[PDB]
Every structure is written in structure tokens, then in C-alpha cells.
Amino acid sequence: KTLGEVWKRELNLLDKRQFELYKRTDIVEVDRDTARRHLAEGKVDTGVAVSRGTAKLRWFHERGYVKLEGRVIDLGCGRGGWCYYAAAQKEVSGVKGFTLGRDGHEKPMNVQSLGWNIITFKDKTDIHRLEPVKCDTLLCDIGESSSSSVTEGERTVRVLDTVEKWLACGVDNFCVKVLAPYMPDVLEKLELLQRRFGGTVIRNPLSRNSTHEMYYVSGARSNVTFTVNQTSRLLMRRMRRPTGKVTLEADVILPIGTRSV
């Protein structure tokens, strides 16, 4: 019954064309042309990002929504866009990335952007059953979209449930994907986590309109209900006023090489 659930219901009423127009209405995307060509050519020393994730984390990072410091852990790293971004930051001392990388799940990608050498990738790992490790910055970008709001809610509560075990070890910084912040139970878990660890949820402008995903971050504190609804209002507005107008932005190019001495 929340505004976001109404949004989800109306999203499912869109035919294929409607959905297509909607998905790219007033959105911002990075141009992946060059990165895709370089990766396809096997170039590992041009500093291109392995995925759209690098730009998403940079957005949070550059405006203080999440500080990237010391020991970084990246749950559900996939190709590794967040790991490579974090590894290139001077304040970061190490990066441990974990992901399934099996049964259709993408495996970490090997490139040599700055600090690749301080990253330890580990695949064939289900982070829901991985024993928490002490760290300073906790990152988690997991949440598989579903036509079912019930399912998005279940997957979202499971992620927050798992992440709470890691935050309970004591972490200074965090950035965690929240697939369905519009679901009632998720909203309440977020409110409880906020009273326990602080932070709030922020909508990344690089996220597509087809998902209501927002990120639980340590760099800001605000009323969760209000801001989740603001995003709901924006998404509903774009569905009612489709245009498919997209704004392209330069993708992230990181420096290259190992961090040594």
C-alpha cells in the first residue's frame, strides 16, 4: 500500500514498449562504448572500468555518502567494479571481494587499474553463509530484481539480515544496496538499522527507473520514510511522463599500475 508498492504494481502493468520507454526516461548513464571495446580486446592497462558499478560507487564516494578507508570488503563483487574503484583510492589499504561466480553468476574480471595488487578476489562464495570478517569499510551491491514485489522484499530483507552480521563486527563506513526500500518490512528494518548503526538510504542517479533500488550508506542521516517516498514520487512521475530522454556522461577512467613500496 506504500507509494512504492503502487509504483511496482503499475510497473507490471506496462507492456513491452511502455516498459522500454520508461526505463530510460530522464536517466543518466555513462558511455560504456570505449570500456567495452578495450575489455573485448583484452586490454588490462587502460584504466577502464570493468562494469557500470565503478561509476555508481564513485558517485557516492565523491560526495561523501560513503568514505572508502582502510580494510575494504565487497560482498557480491561480481566483475569487481567496486573493488577496482576502492583499490585506486589512497585511503584504502586492502580490498577483499567475494562473489558466487558460478551457475551463471559473473566471475571477477582481471584488469590492472591502480591497486589491482591489493585486491583479493574470492569466487564460489555465497556471502550469506560467509563468516563475517573485521573491516573498516563494508560494501555490498546485491539484490536481484523481480517482477514480484513480494520476492524483491524477501531478497532485500535477506541482504539486510546478512549485512547486519557484518556491521555488528564494527565498521566505520558502509554502502549497501537495498533492492526494494518501498516494501513495509524493509522500511522498518532500515529504521531499526539506522538507530543501531546510523546512516540512511540514498538514490543513485545512475540507477535505472525499472528498479527502486537505493543504497544504505554511512555518510548521511535523514528520515528513511520521507526520502524513500521522494524516490517513489520521482519514479511514478517518470512513468506518467515518459520520454526515453537519456543523458550520457563520461565513464570512469582510473589510473593504472600497482600500488607499491
Active site residues: 56, 141, 177, 213
Q: How far apart are CA 203 and CA 145, in angstroms?
A: 16
Instruction: Pick the binder of ligand SAH from 127, 138, 178, 214 (CB under 6 A).
Output: 127
Indicate which single residue of 141, 152, 213, 251 sits in contact with ligand SAH (rule: CB under 6 A): 141
Q: How far is the CB of 119 from ligand SAH (least distance, A)?
A: 12
H/E stretch holding 185: helix 184-197
- Give the residue, chosen from 106, 154, 210, 259, that forms a contact with ligand SAH under the rule CB under 6 A: 106
Site string for ligand SAH, 22-51 (x = CB under 6 A): -----------------------------x
Contact between 132 and ligand SAH by CB under 6 A: the answer reads no
Site track for ligand SAH across 75-104, x = CB under 6 A: -xxxxxxx---------------xxx----
Q: Could you tell me which residues come within 8 angstroms of residue 184 by beta carbon, excluding any fewer than 6 positions away?
A: 2, 5, 153
Binding-site residues: 51, 81-82, 99-100, 126-127, 142, 215
Closest residue to ligand SAH, based on beta-carbon distance:
53
Cβ–Cβ < 8 Å for 215, 60: yes
Numbers of helices and strands, H then E, in the chain = 8, 9
Provide, rounded to whole angstroms, the least separation between the CB of residue 76 and ligand SAH.
3
Q: How many residues bind ligand SAH (CB under 6 A)?
A: 21
Residue from 89, 113, 125, 204 binding ligand SAH (CB under 6 A) = 125
Cα–Cα distances in angstroms (integers) from residue 60 to residues 11, 42, 53, 198, in the given order: 27, 29, 11, 16
- Phi first, then psi: what are they for 27, rounded to 5°? -95, 165
* Residue 104: strand, helix, or coil: coil
C-alpha 145/C-alpha 101 separation (Å) is: 18
Strands 119-122 and 200-202, bridge-based pairing: unpaired
List residues near ligand SAH by CB under 6 A. 51, 53-54, 76-82, 98-100, 105-106, 125-128, 141-142
